[PDB]
Amino acid sequence: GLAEKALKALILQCEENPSLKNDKDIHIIINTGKKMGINRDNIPRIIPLTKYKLFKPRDLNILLITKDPSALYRETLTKDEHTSELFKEIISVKNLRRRFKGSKLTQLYKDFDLVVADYRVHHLLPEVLGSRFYHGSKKLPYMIRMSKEVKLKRQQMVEKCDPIYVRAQLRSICKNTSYIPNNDNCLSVRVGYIQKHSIPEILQNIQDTINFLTDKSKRPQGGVIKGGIISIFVKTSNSTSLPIYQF
């Protein structure tokens, strides 16, 4: 019963200070009790929303980073009319490293709103896409299972993409939010947009994330927090922390 008065003080002050005015997201940052044993990879583990949405995929500048041959992915995605306008630019890794070096990378940080790689080239990417995006987790590159097709061991995996299924993944990755695991206790996850939807939308969105992170079931993506959450702290990218549920 402390949530809204904490959160009304956030939004009211978000209007007043002009330095605070520029930012447009709401994070919840959570100091769990014990140290989380998982070290920080940059594989963003997404959580599901049970009630609301965060973004339709037609609200975001969306970059897609695919494999090298890339003609099977360029032209299947464009023509099949579920994903014509869905991606802003379809780019290849070979055409990413070669094209955007140096100071063009800050523009591409600022140009696109959400970046998604093919899963099988997601790991090669922090050298290519650059060390700007790995400051925090705003433009952290998601991955999409391109194919709905498994790689069997000692077996040629065929190249094939079906734009119903990658549309289905972007709808499943833009409506809900995402955390990243840390070796320490403090971690963060975004909960809502500051003017898309107000406090009772965010307040339902709060209780899903602390529920998904706590369950022993749904374990490889939600079974992270062991023991009990000590506190949760509502604050933007720039504001100070506002306590809620101090025990």
């Binding site: 003080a9 956030l10 002050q13 100070t240 922390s241 506002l242 306590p243």
Partner: peptide, 17 residues
């Protein structure tokens, strides 16, 4: 005036420390 009361709360906790 609740936000600054929290903002002075964390700030005064350091200077006590």
């Amino acid at each position: 005036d609740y936000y600054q009361q929290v903002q002075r709360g964390k700030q005064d906790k350091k200077i006590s420390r």
